[PDB]
Design a protein around this ligand. Structure first.
Ligand SMILES: [Mg+2]
Ligand SMILES: [Mg+2]
Ligand SMILES: [Mg+2]
Ligand SMILES: [Mg+2]
Ligand SMILES: [Mg+2]
Ligand SMILES: [Mg+2]
Lengths: 148, 201, 186, 180, 105
RNA sequence: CUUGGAUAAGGUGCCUAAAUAUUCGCUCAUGAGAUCCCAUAAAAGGUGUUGGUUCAUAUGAACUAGCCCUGAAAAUGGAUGGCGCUAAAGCGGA
């Protein structure tokens, strides 16, 4: 062969296609409808146009099961997994790749975690937040007054 | 439905689905104001819907047409009539429900400075497959003698210009307030800052 | 049945500038600029400027929908040919006893037709935007209609032809009129 | 575990014979494999076919077994081919179809739905012959060939499906169907 | 900044009915943030107050109340069936009620 | 004669109590369709679209039956009960 120069190279990395996030072994798939709602998983196999086999290794609370594709939301992350993997190899791969923990750093993961934190607050904690905001208001209003 | 008033702009909504969701709200008791009624959509070809209006036009009281069906043809009065046919408007309660609806073409003053809501359960983009045919209510009503389609468009141009200037000023204000916020975080006792950071405020 | 993928590839000629953003196409060349929109059929199309080849791809589709790919490809080829070498339609006007007289006015627009079957009246047609009407320099009874857009030039050529249709006689015997005789390029 | 996704079709294995007599004191024994909703229906179909094909009526016969076969690899994907016979409004025909699933009764569930959707054929007018498994080099229908390429990818173009509590009626910004 | 709230807002729909018959022993209520059957079960023992105004004075005051209870749900969407000590009049079918939180658990 | 519970027939877009529920197919109508009695439609046709059978080296045929269409003309202005409905609120299933 003759290989590709840098010119062609970045040029490949500049074509932003309309469609990203394909269905394939490795996509991340937040789940949206049904009893396992609000949980993560992975595609491991596709049966038909509408039916898919889905598996979240023993890290997440979802077992290996068939699911209608329309209940899913594809995410940005993909793991590069093998031909016909089982759950055990998938756990090792997701552990050694650190993909779940860098979904946690994205825009959607941060807000999901913050909402969770806000849901188990206690009455004293709610008062503490209210008090802190009341304190911050005074500094806002003195700085604003000094400005004009 | 626990508010003094909801303002909807009807641009891009299907006529029947929107009319069915307004009527139940009115029956439960809620003032509703609907604007931009000329942008409502219907789910057939334009010719096919014009045929239906033509059929509606040829039924009248034979002995005296002053009575009988009155053929209203402004795009907002049409939504008014379609809503009226989903209510029991011949009882006192169902006549009270009908009087709580206000419809406009374009966007007059009191409401050009309010907040507008949409109903995703009735949006054309989410309900109608892309190879089907549809028409626009303003075009259909102009084809049967309404005569004001051009004037409202000319008015909407100016309304959008004024809104653009407002939006510019607002974005400047939010930036100028965010900088003040980020400066004032360092003047607070560490406990309040830590509790604010833990809950992401 | 739904097919998964389907594609077709269209080369780009030498002296052409192309642009596509949201299924909206603009092309430019020596003889002007052409615009066209395709936002009525589900496609995502891909333009490679370093090389040639716009490409058209459609995901899950049925035979009814899959038939529109070649249509768009042929339209793109047509407007590439248009900007570099203009389209040309040749026409011949024919008579048995009364000769037909034509006259071109208003900067080579707006032909005027006189003496059709001896009528003493006058008939007018007006060219579509971007079309020019002029008479052949070579032969006796020929018209040239031309320029940059197959749709408009063919529609002008058909509008001239519909203007001298013959009323209630036997049209197998009364054969006067103006007819399209050659389609080519400039 | 999610009952909103279950079909109610299972497979059964039934064995039966005729009551011995003096003219016949060691009669023939028969077996079938039937798909039904429960064991009682499977026995009903077994006796229906015993009467139609052989000369057995339930009243002078006895039943020997009812097993309810289970499936061995319920998470591997197989190919299936089915042979049919059904009645139209003006005659009777027989057909061959192909499905992709992880269980035989999963494929039979699809078959009943398709025969109702495409031909308005009721379950009372369908006889099922010979479900089996077929290798991937001997598949005939084009809509199954599409699914067995080397590197299968495609985008997800469906509209969102959301829980009932997040399915709110007054939105504050009109949503998007793009979702990349 | 005064007069704390301590209840959730509600709206009184009509009676428990079918098409063409009435049965005024029970009444239907909508609760503001509740729109599933499973979230309506949370409130299934609380006391309900309906407060309205009059024009004459009755015991020195011009406000009176009718008391009720939350009894069960009404199916898939968060409506509830309530029972009151007297029957609610029909001239109230869009008015406001208080779903209190007294019998606390 | 009553209080409370849970159903049948039938229904769950609004009129109207309860799903704009879930899961598979089919259908576009310049006079679509919408379930006992029940409130009309045929012979004969279709290069509309979807499945199936049988022949001939990847093309050419011949049949078969689901939805749609032609065949389809009356007298006051009118009737799937009305509005309306085409990612159905239509037809066959779960
Ligand atoms: Mg004549
Ligand atoms: Mg009772
Ligand atoms: Mg209701
Ligand atoms: Mg032949
Ligand atoms: Mg009815
Ligand atoms: Mg209904």
């Amino acid at each position: 062969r003759v290989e590709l120069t840098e010119e062609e190279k970045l040029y490949i990395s500049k074509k932003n296609l309309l469609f990203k996030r394909f269905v394939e072994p490795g996509r991340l798939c937040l789940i949206e409808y049904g009893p396992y709602a609000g949980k993560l998983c992975f595609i491991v196999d596709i049966v038909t146009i509408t039916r898919v086999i889905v598996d979240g290794a023993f890290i997440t609370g979802v077992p290996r099961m068939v699911i209608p594709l329309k209940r899913l939301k594809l995410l940005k992350e993909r793991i590069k997994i093998n031909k016909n993997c089982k759950s055990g190899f998938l756990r090792k791969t997701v552990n050694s790749t650190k993909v779940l923990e860098e979904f946690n750093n994205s825009k959607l993961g941060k807000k999901m975690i913050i909402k969770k934190k806000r849901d188990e607050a206690t009455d004293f904690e709610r008062f503490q937040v209210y008090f802190a905001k009341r304190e911050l208001k005074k500094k806002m209003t003195t700085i604003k007054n000094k400005k004009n | 439905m626990y508010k003094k008033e909801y303002v909807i702009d009807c641009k891009g909504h299907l006529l029947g689905r929107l009319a069915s969701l307004i009527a139940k709200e009115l029956l439960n008791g809620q003032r509703i104001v609907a604007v931009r009624c000329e942008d409502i959509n219907i789910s057939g070809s334009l010719y096919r819907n014009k045929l239906k209006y033509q059929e509606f036009l040829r039924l009248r009281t034979n002995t005296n047409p002053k009575k009988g069906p009155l053929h209203l043809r402004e795009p907002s009065k049409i939504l008014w009539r379609c809503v009226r046919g989903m209510l029991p408007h011949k009882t006192y309660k169902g006549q009270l429900a009908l009087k709580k609806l206000k419809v406009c073409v374009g966007m007059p003053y009191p409401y050009d400075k309010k907040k507008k809501y949409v109903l995703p359960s009735a949006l054309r983009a989410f309900r109608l497959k892309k190879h089907r045919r549809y028409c626009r209510l303003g075009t259909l009503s102009s084809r049967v003698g309404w005569n004001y389609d051009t004037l409202v468009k000319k008015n909407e141009v100016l309304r959008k210009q004024v809104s653009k200037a407002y939006y510019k000023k607002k974005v400047n204000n939010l930036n100028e307030k965010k900088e003040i916020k980020t400066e004032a975080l360092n003047l607070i006792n560490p406990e309040q800052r830590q509790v604010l950071e833990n809950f992401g405020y | 049945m739904k097919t998964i993928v389907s594609t077709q590839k269209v080369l780009i000629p030498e002296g052409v500038k192309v642009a596509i953003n949201a299924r909206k196409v603009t092309v430019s060349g020596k003889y002007g600029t052409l615009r066209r929109s395709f936002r009525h059929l589900p496609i995502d199309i891909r333009l490679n400027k370093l090389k040639k080849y716009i490409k058209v791809v459609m995901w899950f589709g049925v035979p009814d929908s899959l038939a529109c790919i070649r249509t768009v490809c042929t339209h793109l080829k047509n407007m590439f040919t248009g900007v570099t070498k203009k389209f040309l339609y040749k026409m011949r006007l024919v008579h048995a006893h009364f000769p037909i007289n034509s006259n071109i006015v208003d900067n080579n627009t707006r032909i005027e037709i006189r003496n059709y079957l001896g009528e003493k009246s006058v008939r007018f047609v007006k060219a579509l935007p971007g079309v020019v009407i002029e008479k052949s320099p070579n032969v006796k009874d020929e018209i040239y209609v031309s320029g940059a857009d197959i749709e408009n030039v063919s529609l002008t050529a058909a509008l001239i032809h519909q203007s001298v249709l013959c009323r209630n006689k036997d049209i197998r015997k009364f054969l006067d009129g103006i007819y399209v005789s050659e389609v080519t390029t400039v | 575990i999610d009952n909103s996704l279950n079909t109610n079709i299972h497979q059964y294995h039934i064995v039966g014979r005729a009551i011995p007599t003096a003219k016949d004191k060691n009669p023939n024994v028969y077996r079938m494999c039937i798909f039904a909703k429960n064991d009682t229906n499977a026995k009903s179909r077994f006796w229906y076919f015993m009467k139609k094909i052989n000369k057995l009526k339930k009243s002078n016969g006895e039943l020997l077994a009812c097993e309810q076969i289970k499936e061995r690899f319920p998470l591997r994907v197989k190919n299936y081919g089915v042979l049919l016979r059904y009645d139209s409004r003006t005659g009777t025909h027989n057909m061959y179809k192909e499905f992709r699933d992880t269980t035989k009764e999963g494929a039979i569930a699809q078959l009943y739905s398709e025969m109702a959707g495409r031909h308005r054929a009721r379950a009372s007018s369908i006889n099922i012959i010979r479900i089996s498994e077929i290798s991937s080099s001997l598949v005939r229908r084009p809509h199954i060939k599409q699914l067995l390429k080397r590197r299968l990818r495609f985008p997800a173009l469906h509209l969102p499906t959301l829980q009932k509590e997040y399915r709110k009626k007054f939105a504050s910004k009109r949503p998007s169907t793009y979702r990349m | 900044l005064q007069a704390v709230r301590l209840y959730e807002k509600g709206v009184i729909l009509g009676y428990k009915r079918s098409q063409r018959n009435q049965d005024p022993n029970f009444t239907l209520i909508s609760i503001k943030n509740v729109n599933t059957k499973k979230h309506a079960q949370f409130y299934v023992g609380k006391r309900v107050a309906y407060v309205y105004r009059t024009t004459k004075h009755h015991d020195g005051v011009k406000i009176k109340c009718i008391w009720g209870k939350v009894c069960r749900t009404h199916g898939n969407s968060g409506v509830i069936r309530a029972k009151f000590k007297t029957h609610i009049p029909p001239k109230a079918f869009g008015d406001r009620v208080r779903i209190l939180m007294y019998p606390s658990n």
